[PDB]
Design a protein around this ligand. Structure first.
Ligand SMILES: NC(=O)c1ccc[n+]([C@@H]2O[C@H](COP(=O)([O-])OP(=O)(O)OC[C@H]3O[C@@H](n4cnc5c(N)ncnc54)[C@H](O)[C@@H]3O)[C@@H](O)[C@H]2O)c1
Ligand SMILES: NC(=O)c1ccc[n+]([C@@H]2O[C@H](COP(=O)([O-])OP(=O)(O)OC[C@H]3O[C@@H](n4cnc5c(N)ncnc54)[C@H](O)[C@@H]3O)[C@@H](O)[C@H]2O)c1
Ligand SMILES: NC(=O)c1ccc[n+]([C@@H]2O[C@H](COP(=O)([O-])OP(=O)(O)OC[C@H]3O[C@@H](n4cnc5c(N)ncnc54)[C@H](O)[C@@H]3O)[C@@H](O)[C@H]2O)c1
Ligand SMILES: NC(=O)c1ccc[n+]([C@@H]2O[C@H](COP(=O)([O-])OP(=O)(O)OC[C@H]3O[C@@H](n4cnc5c(N)ncnc54)[C@H](O)[C@@H]3O)[C@@H](O)[C@H]2O)c1
Ligand SMILES: O=C(O)c1cc2cc(O)ccc2cc1O
Ligand SMILES: O=C(O)c1cc2cc(O)ccc2cc1O
Ligand SMILES: O=C(O)c1cc2cc(O)ccc2cc1O
Ligand SMILES: O=C(O)c1cc2cc(O)ccc2cc1O
Lengths: 305, 305, 305, 305
């Protein structure tokens, strides 16, 4: 069928949730690839059955064979471990995967999740050989969903009606742009002026946003459901040609004064992949912060070769 | 059942589309009320069957009996004709309807569509006797969907990723705020600066937006599908408690310097109805325009008593 | 984009509803083709805007140019008038349309609605030249939605949980198979035995089902919303590769003892179009009825050449 | 808000998936209750953020406090361990939970998942004190989704277009009724007669269906995504008043010749909970099998008091 083939190179936690969500939305056939034997076949089996409950018809199969990447339309990479000691190592994993992407599905759209994602996405870009508009890393969508949500719960408005922008990198050096936050299209400042939300609050929310994954870990859980949903938001925008403005890690070719590196910025995802890279007209203050994010990305890139 | 009862006081064009959309989304039971005999029963019959195709269970019935308003949770008024000669006349229709709302379903949430809507919504507010937070008029959501769409098609981005604000009134005196237009959360000016969209273009789009209903009429059609979808967006936000920021006609109690009148402004619709009235921090220029819109509303209010 | 192009050859009542539903479900781009000047552009304009309310990105345009059929992936024909005097005439319309389909979009999937549909679908099959698995007529899905719904409202169960089969023809000679009606997978007889629904009731429902369009007309309405939803159910099954079992008019090649004619029967719609034609193992009694339906189809076929 | 409060007494694997699905469908607010400290707060945090990606507004919070059950509209119990040694023990857990349900939310709708579910559901029925129509156990929906899916993949039709019935018990003594399997409303026998599917195949599928959870476990996974989706299908039918025919564990009051026990049978879930208990008109052969299922349920009931 013209049905899209979506291969998940990594069938761990994020892997189960995406499979679940893809059937829920009838986005395409799913391959849960992993190097752990059998488990993917297991998850795939359990997942396959939801087709019934969902009025869906998406094949879900497992795989311990790289060559199942053949004909993949979308590929989503979560494979890897989890310090700077793991870098040369997740780098070896990206290198192996890109080899197989180039061999089996060079025209696939690629989304990288493996952390640190702005480093790792570039690594795979170079080894897979795909065009720059055909590969992005997860980051911005997830990070902003936290900023958007926290604010929405203070202002008692629909979460999606908060817009925000986080750029530069995923991780600790991510840049929260207080200047680009709106509520129902309206500048956030207006709501600060009305004493509906204070600057002190909003600063507590910013640190909360930056520290979320960590907050989740210390509560004896692990962040994987949000990551999943955001990845799928991006994937769906590719498959359905929605042209959503979504913040992802992508190849900078002069934006923000930066080149020959991947960094977080709003892009437009549609049928051609990255159809636009939107550059925010940052002031020097917010550009200084962007610079620190790109510098930490370069630093971990060197630690892996 | 706790299933909501949605009564459509008016089963003409907008009336058929809402019924269709409500079943599509399983929002509630529908009553197509009209004074035209039988027709509502007809539309209701045809509509009822889509329950099958939609995996839905919403009763859809017709009605030539006002007292079918009893127990309505939501009421949506499109009844009326279509000059200032029709005002004292659509006023007599609002007067009759409010009487029945007060008698049969005083705790209903009310949405007025009948034009001119900012006049007519106030008229019904006073005669039905419902609380100020339980009644709004259609206007802003529809008008902005046109502004949002036209821009989206120039910038090649997802329509919903355009946000805009139109206030003051529905109709010719509606106020387009160029200052409050964003794309993927980003100020529109940034995209003007990049020569992706020009000021001359955007001005052509503004006049297009203001003249749409008229453009549709001269193409030998009539605007009713968009009106329908927007009304339902508002209704759904009420029923589901979504707290969406939506621009509707509502009772001004000092905002924009205006009182004892209905005018278009972003509100938050949830379970309590109008849960917030958001006042835009307009400059004098945009406030002068707001004033002209409120003045035309007052002027047609007088022509009906 | 890989986004599907859906052309509606006929932009009247059924035409507006499908456009509406297609955007609602982000199924594809829509062309409202009609021979009436401008009107399609009008409907398309109004419809285009719902993209915003729906989180959708489907182009909707009008057309008075047959050659806009070029590259269409799906084509849905509602064009025509509405006696046996109109046959040689709607036949001339199918002949003109097939010419353009063969010229501009020979690989399109085709759905015929124009009545009488089992005659008219064959007419277009022969003049367009498309493969037998790439063209069906609306009938069964619509007719059964009425049978399913009426029963569901007596048994107080979800409408979709009623299954039924109507075959042979759309129209008065349609064959209701009482033997193939189930509720939640369970034979209807079981519910007759329990005195939850009587044979006399169910017979009243059968005549109701057969006479619905007529019942709708005498209530001063016209049946177009259900037709729309069912057409879209079929179209969606094609586009999404859902392999739904849906009753449509299709080319009989020996089933039910019939050949070289179109008649209503369950088929499976997926990516290859008609992927299976399911033949019901009818007893002689129900086959006698099938025969009368095919005979009326042949009879009106002759009246048009 | 009238927004429903859905409390998940158990925030393990099935627990994360339901939370995910409930936000996806904007079904209500979610409380992830568990006795494990913090973890529920963690999962809830991660989950809460998907509100953004989903256009949703469902609160998701954690809880280590039973009294958070207060005002719950729906309660879904997955708490417990996993031999007949664990019975008197999961029994002590049901006893504690029912105490809190009776105290805090006696009018809640209850769905039991804890295994063995037909035993455990009755246990909670007696200790919570809720009406018989307000409590069911998961079983039939999940089990049939496997039977439906496997068959659908042989016949190449949409999964949901297979209907089947499994009754009596969840677990090894579950009764597969070959006689009540249909495809697109049509008896399965017809498809056996056509040599599209054989009896030997279908028997392999039956044993597959019975052994699925076990098949999933030996592939180094655990069955939790399907269980989740089915539970939510049931919950959604309650909340939305869909009147779906769904097979669940419920109180038998003479059906199948059985009393004063819970067993699997098609029911109709709507606003009143269990609105109907449908009794299948089983022959003696299939009733003998039903009897063995009820006997194993009674046997494990005794092992817990
Ligand atoms: N970019 C982001 O916003 C973001 C957010 C959260 C997590 N993450 C990252 O995503 C990754 C995974 O998250 P998770 O929670 O699913 O982890 P997980 O450990 O549950 O899954 C990783 C899977 O990859 C497998 N694996 C190892 N080598 C492989 C290979 N060559 N091919 C296929 N699979 C291989 C593992 O066995 C495991 O199943 C991590 O690196 C994490 O840091 C990124
Ligand atoms: N506010 C907005 O953004 C907006 C947009 C478009 C249209 N409109 C307005 O909505 C109204 C209707 O639009 P439509 O296209 O559905 O019109 P329509 O003529 O097709 O429907 C109006 C219906 O009301 C009926 N009616 C008259 N008196 C009635 C009564 N007392 N009770 C019930 N029904 C009664 C008519 O018979 C008719 O069926 C008009 O006044 C129009 O100006 C408003
Ligand atoms: N098969 C079914 O189950 C079923 C059910 C209901 C209605 N119908 C049939 O569908 C058809 C239309 O239904 P409707 O309610 O949309 O009717 P409608 O009159 O509102 O629409 C028909 C449209 O076709 C146009 N037309 C005429 N010649 C044309 C051409 N060459 N190209 C494009 N358009 C042309 C007309 O101007 C009109 O806009 C009728 O023939 C009716 O009998 C079929
Ligand atoms: N009926 C069915 O069709 C079906 C299908 C699959 C699984 N199950 C059953 O569902 C149950 C759980 O499945 P899972 O995969 O989510 O298991 P899980 O172990 O991941 O979750 C069970 C949770 O309950 C907790 N718990 C223990 N006592 C508790 C209490 N008093 N209150 C709240 N939580 C408590 C545990 O800490 C754990 O988080 C099992 O008993 C299993 O056998 C039933
Ligand atoms: O959830 C996150 O945001 C996140 C972020 C990061 C960043 C990073 O650099 C390593 C690992 C993780 C793991 C995570 O789960
Ligand atoms: O579609 C519209 O925007 C619109 C607006 C107005 C305004 C008005 O004042 C009268 C009638 C209409 C009718 C309409 O259809
Ligand atoms: O709605 C229907 O079922 C229907 C059926 C038929 C059958 C027919 O033969 C001509 C016209 C119509 C028009 C219709 O609207
Ligand atoms: O998935 C199932 O069907 C299932 C069934 C059963 C039955 C049972 O008796 C105990 C535990 C389980 C666990 C499970 O996961």
């Amino acid at each position: 069928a013209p049905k899209a083939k979506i291969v998940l190179v990594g069938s761990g936690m994020i892997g189960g949730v995406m499979a679940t969500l893809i059937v829920q939305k009838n986005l395409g056939d799913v391959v849960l690839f992993d190097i752990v034997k059998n488990m993917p076949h297991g998850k795939a089996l359990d997942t396959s059955h939801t087709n019934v409950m969902a009025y869906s018809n998406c094949k879900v199969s497992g795989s311990n064979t790289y060559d199942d990447l053949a004909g993949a339309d979308v590929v989503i990479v979560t494979a890897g471990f989890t310090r700077d000691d793991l870098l040369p190592l997740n780098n070896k994993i990206m290198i192996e995967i890109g080899g197989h992407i180039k061999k089996n599905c060079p025209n696939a759209f690629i989304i990288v999740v493996t952390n640190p994602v702005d480093v790792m996405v570039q690594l795979l870009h170079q080894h897979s050989g795909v065009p720059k508009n055909k590969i992005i890393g997860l980051g911005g969508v997830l990070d902003t969903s936290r900023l958007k949500y926290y604010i929405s719960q203070k202002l008692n408005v629909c979460p999606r009606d908060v817009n925000a922008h986080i750029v530069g990198a995923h991780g600790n050096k991510m840049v929260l742009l207080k200047r680009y936050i709106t509520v129902g299209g309206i500048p956030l400042q207006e709501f600060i002026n009305n004493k509906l939300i204070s600057d002190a609050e909003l600063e507590a929310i910013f640190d909360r946003t930056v520290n979320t994954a960590l907050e989740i870990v210390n509560l004896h859980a692990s962040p994987y459901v949000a990551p999943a949903a955001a990845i799928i938001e991006m994937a769906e925008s590719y498959l359905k040609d929605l042209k959503k403005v979504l913040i992802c890690s992508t190849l900078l070719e002069g934006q923000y004064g930066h080149s020959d590196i991947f960094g977080g910025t709003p892009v437009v995802l549609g049928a051609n992949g990255v159809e636009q890279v939107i550059e925010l007209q940052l002031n020097s203050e917010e550009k200084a912060k962007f610079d620190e994010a790109i510098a930490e990305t370069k630093r971990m890139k060197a630690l892996a070769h």
